[PDB]
Design a protein around this motif. Structure first.
Motif, PDB file in Angstrom:
ATOM      1  N   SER A   5       0.831  -1.193   0.000  1.00 38.80           N
ATOM      2  CA  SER A   5       0.000   0.000   0.000  1.00 38.80           C
ATOM      3  C   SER A   5       0.871   1.252   0.000  1.00 38.80           C
ATOM      4  CB  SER A   5      -0.849   0.021   1.252  1.00 38.80           C
ATOM      5  OG  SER A   5       0.010  -0.324   2.350  1.00 38.80           O
ATOM      6  N   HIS A   6       0.245   2.356  -0.390  1.00 36.04           N
ATOM      7  CA  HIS A   6       0.836   3.656  -0.196  1.00 36.04           C
ATOM      8  C   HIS A   6       0.497   4.165   1.184  1.00 36.04           C
ATOM      9  CE1 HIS A   6       2.613   7.324  -2.004  1.00 36.04           C
ATOM     10  NE2 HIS A   6       2.070   7.784  -0.876  1.00 36.04           N
ATOM     11  N   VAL A   7       1.540   4.468   1.986  1.00 37.00           N
ATOM     12  CA  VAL A   7       1.442   4.814   3.406  1.00 37.00           C
ATOM     13  C   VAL A   7       2.049   6.186   3.631  1.00 37.00           C
ATOM     14  CG1 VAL A   7       1.496   2.369   4.087  1.00 37.00           C
ATOM     15  CG2 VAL A   7       3.623   3.708   4.126  1.00 37.00           C
ATOM     16  N   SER A   8       1.725   6.736   4.789  1.00 34.83           N
ATOM     17  CA  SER A   8       2.324   7.979   5.177  1.00 34.83           C
ATOM     18  C   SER A   8       3.842   7.818   5.307  1.00 34.83           C
ATOM     19  CB  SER A   8       1.691   8.338   6.518  1.00 34.83           C
ATOM     20  OG  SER A   8       2.599   9.004   7.314  1.00 34.83           O
ATOM     21  N   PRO A   9       4.604   8.889   5.078  1.00 32.02           N
ATOM     22  CA  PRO A   9       6.060   8.802   5.242  1.00 32.02           C
ATOM     23  C   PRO A   9       6.519   8.687   6.679  1.00 32.02           C
ATOM     24  CG  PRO A   9       5.395  10.948   4.266  1.00 32.02           C
ATOM     25  CD  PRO A   9       4.151  10.236   4.694  1.00 32.02           C
ATOM     26  N   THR A  10       5.623   8.792   7.646  1.00 33.10           N
ATOM     27  CA  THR A  10       6.059   8.950   9.028  1.00 33.10           C
ATOM     28  C   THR A  10       6.796   7.730   9.589  1.00 33.10           C
ATOM     29  OG1 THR A  10       4.321  10.563   9.373  1.00 33.10           O
ATOM     30  CG2 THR A  10       5.212   9.363  11.308  1.00 33.10           C
ATOM     31  N   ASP A  11       6.298   6.531   9.365  1.00 33.23           N
ATOM     32  CA  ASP A  11       6.921   5.340   9.945  1.00 33.23           C
ATOM     33  C   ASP A  11       6.542   4.172   9.059  1.00 33.23           C
ATOM     34  OD1 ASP A  11       6.907   3.885  13.326  1.00 33.23           O
ATOM     35  OD2 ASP A  11       7.911   3.198  11.495  1.00 33.23           O
ATOM     36  N   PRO A  12       7.171   4.065   7.890  1.00 34.50           N
ATOM     37  CA  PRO A  12       6.734   3.066   6.902  1.00 34.50           C
ATOM     38  C   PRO A  12       6.727   1.651   7.445  1.00 34.50           C
ATOM     39  CG  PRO A  12       8.322   4.527   5.956  1.00 34.50           C
ATOM     40  CD  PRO A  12       8.232   4.949   7.356  1.00 34.50           C
ATOM     41  N   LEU A  13       7.682   1.306   8.293  1.00 35.16           N
ATOM     42  CA  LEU A  13       7.736  -0.070   8.760  1.00 35.16           C
ATOM     43  C   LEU A  13       6.536  -0.378   9.663  1.00 35.16           C
ATOM     44  CD1 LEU A  13      11.631  -0.197   9.628  1.00 35.16           C
ATOM     45  CD2 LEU A  13      10.700  -0.588   7.365  1.00 35.16           C
ATOM     46  N   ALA A  15       3.567   1.190   9.603  1.00 37.60           N
ATOM     47  CA  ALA A  15       2.388   1.184   8.751  1.00 37.60           C
ATOM     48  C   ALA A  15       2.280  -0.105   7.958  1.00 37.60           C
ATOM     49  CB  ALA A  15       2.396   2.385   7.806  1.00 37.60           C
ATOM     50  N   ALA A  16       3.397  -0.596   7.425  1.00 44.09           N
ATOM     51  CA  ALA A  16       3.344  -1.829   6.654  1.00 44.09           C
ATOM     52  C   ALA A  16       2.809  -2.960   7.516  1.00 44.09           C
ATOM     53  CB  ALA A  16       4.741  -2.190   6.145  1.00 44.09           C
ATOM     54  N   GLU A  17       3.322  -3.070   8.742  1.00 46.53           N
ATOM     55  CA  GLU A  17       2.868  -4.153   9.600  1.00 46.53           C
ATOM     56  C   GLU A  17       1.401  -3.997   9.959  1.00 46.53           C
ATOM     57  OE1 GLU A  17       5.042  -6.451   9.933  1.00 46.53           O
ATOM     58  OE2 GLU A  17       3.947  -7.824  11.200  1.00 46.53           O
ATOM     59  N   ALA A  18       0.959  -2.769  10.223  1.00 50.02           N
ATOM     60  CA  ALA A  18      -0.452  -2.564  10.534  1.00 50.02           C
ATOM     61  C   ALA A  18      -1.354  -2.931   9.367  1.00 50.02           C
ATOM     62  CB  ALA A  18      -0.680  -1.119  10.888  1.00 50.02           C
ATOM     63  N   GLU A  19      -0.893  -2.757   8.141  1.00 50.12           N
ATOM     64  CA  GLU A  19      -1.722  -3.027   6.971  1.00 50.12           C
ATOM     65  C   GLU A  19      -1.510  -4.406   6.386  1.00 50.12           C
ATOM     66  OE1 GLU A  19      -1.647   0.290   4.358  1.00 50.12           O
ATOM     67  OE2 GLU A  19      -1.840   1.627   6.115  1.00 50.12           O
ATOM     68  N   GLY A  20      -0.616  -5.213   6.955  1.00 51.76           N
ATOM     69  CA  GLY A  20      -0.281  -6.496   6.357  1.00 51.76           C
ATOM     70  C   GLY A  20       0.342  -6.349   4.991  1.00 51.76           C
ATOM     71  N   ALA A  21       1.117  -5.288   4.788  1.00 55.00           N
ATOM     72  CA  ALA A  21       1.739  -4.988   3.492  1.00 55.00           C
ATOM     73  C   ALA A  21       3.126  -5.613   3.403  1.00 55.00           C
ATOM     74  CB  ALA A  21       1.851  -3.464   3.348  1.00 55.00           C
ATOM     75  N   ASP A  22       3.421  -6.209   2.247  1.00 57.22           N
ATOM     76  CA  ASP A  22       4.734  -6.761   1.957  1.00 57.22           C
ATOM     77  C   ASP A  22       5.673  -5.741   1.390  1.00 57.22           C
ATOM     78  OD1 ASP A  22       3.933  -9.576   2.135  1.00 57.22           O
ATOM     79  OD2 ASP A  22       3.019  -9.280   0.134  1.00 57.22           O
ATOM     80  N   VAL A  23       5.141  -4.643   0.892  1.00 58.14           N
ATOM     81  CA  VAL A  23       5.885  -3.561   0.263  1.00 58.14           C
ATOM     82  C   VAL A  23       5.073  -2.318   0.552  1.00 58.14           C
ATOM     83  CG1 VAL A  23       6.955  -4.870  -1.622  1.00 58.14           C
ATOM     84  CG2 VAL A  23       4.610  -3.941  -1.927  1.00 58.14           C
ATOM     85  N   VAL A  24       5.728  -1.163   0.525  1.00 57.44           N
ATOM     86  CA  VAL A  24       4.985   0.090   0.661  1.00 57.44           C
ATOM     87  C   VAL A  24       5.510   1.107  -0.336  1.00 57.44           C
ATOM     88  CG1 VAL A  24       4.301  -0.219   3.067  1.00 57.44           C
ATOM     89  CG2 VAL A  24       6.370   1.040   2.535  1.00 57.44           C
ATOM     90  N   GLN A  25       4.734   2.168  -0.535  1.00 57.95           N
ATOM     91  CA  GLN A  25       5.165   3.300  -1.340  1.00 57.95           C
ATOM     92  C   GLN A  25       4.904   4.570  -0.533  1.00 57.95           C
ATOM     93  OE1 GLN A  25       4.322   3.597  -5.843  1.00 57.95           O
ATOM     94  NE2 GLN A  25       2.803   4.966  -4.861  1.00 57.95           N
ATOM     95  N   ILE A  26       5.845   5.519  -0.584  1.00 57.66           N
ATOM     96  CA  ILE A  26       5.725   6.787   0.131  1.00 57.66           C
ATOM     97  C   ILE A  26       6.144   7.934  -0.774  1.00 57.66           C
ATOM     98  CG2 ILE A  26       6.178   5.720   2.384  1.00 57.66           C
ATOM     99  CD1 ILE A  26       8.988   6.833   2.309  1.00 57.66           C
TER     100      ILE A  26
END
Ligand code: ZN
Ligand code: ZN
Ligand code: ZN
Length: 252
Positions: A5-13, A15-26
């Motif tokens: 998912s595309h997440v806020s730049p604040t704390d990508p790691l 956010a990824a865990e909260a969303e169950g994301a394997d990759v993120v975009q910021i």
């Protein structure tokens, strides 16, 4: 494939865990700003982490503009974005196709893209993303992308397919992957977005999967045909479910 998912730049790691994301975009900074991206106190931790982080370049970059006061700052912020992305160990940088001011200038816009690529300094790959609106674009309609790729296709530039943009452009999703790959030979990243608007609207209003007007099965089929990592660029609350849906439907 990896789905995130595309997440806020604040704390990508986190956010990824909260969303169950394997990759993120910021974005590195404000998506709509011309200020250079600022160094991050967490850069070394992001660079060391295993989570792939894609960087979206600022939206105002228009490498095709005839206006020197746009084109020159666009190249500079793209350079700065690629350097800042390398500083965090990013997977790639995504930049929109841009546009010219009127239909007569389209071919010159392609040459300006080539000139920018001939001067681009990057340690991470760059992908061009298709766009939604009627704007004398370089990469809204697939016919235009074919003419663009005749000019820039040998540069190594990659391609990011955004499903909402495709829909808003009036292109059919059923064979979009096949048609794009016949042109570019490649899809390096998919932005899997539903749309709040009807096909061909020329508006860019993403929706969580199933909350908009695009049959989710068309989105799943496009994701499977491309095979690429996926970013859902959808509203925060529904994003974990968007990712989980795609993960289950693709056997990831
Ligand atoms: Zn984009
Ligand atoms: Zn996108
Ligand atoms: Zn969009």
């Amino acid at each position: 494939m990896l789905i995130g998912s595309h997440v806020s730049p604040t704390d990508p790691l986190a956010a990824a865990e909260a969303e169950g994301a394997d990759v993120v975009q910021i974005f590195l900074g404000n998506p709509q700003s011309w200020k250079a991206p600022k160094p991050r106190d967490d850069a070394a931790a992001l660079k060391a982490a295993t989570l792939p982080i894609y960087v979206h370049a600022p939206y105002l970059i228009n490498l095709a503009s005839a206006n020197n006061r746009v084109r020159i700052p666009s190249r500079k912020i793209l350079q700065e974005t690629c350097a800042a992305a390398a500083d965090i160990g990013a997977a790639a940088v995504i930049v929109h196709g841009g546009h010219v001011a009127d239909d007569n200038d389209i071919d010159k816009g392609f040459q300006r893209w080539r000139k920018a690529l001939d001067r681009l300094e990057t340690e991470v790959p760059v992908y061009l993303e298709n766009t939604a609106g009627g704007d004398h674009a370089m990469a809204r309609r697939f016919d235009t992308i074919a003419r663009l790729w005749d000019v820039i296709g040998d540069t190594g530039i990659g391609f990011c397919l955004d499903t909402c943009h495709t829909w808003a452009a009036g292109e059919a999703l059923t064979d979009a992957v096949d048609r794009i790959k016949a042109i570019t030979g490649r899809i390096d990243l998919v932005h899997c977005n539903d749309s709040r608007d009807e096909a061909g609207s020329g508006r860019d209003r993403h929706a969580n999967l199933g909350s908009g007007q695009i049959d989710p099965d068309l989105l799943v089929a496009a994701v499977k045909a491309a095979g690429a990592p996926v970013i859902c660029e959808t509203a925060d609350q529904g994003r974990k479910d968007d990712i989980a849906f795609l993960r289950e439907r693709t056997g990831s």
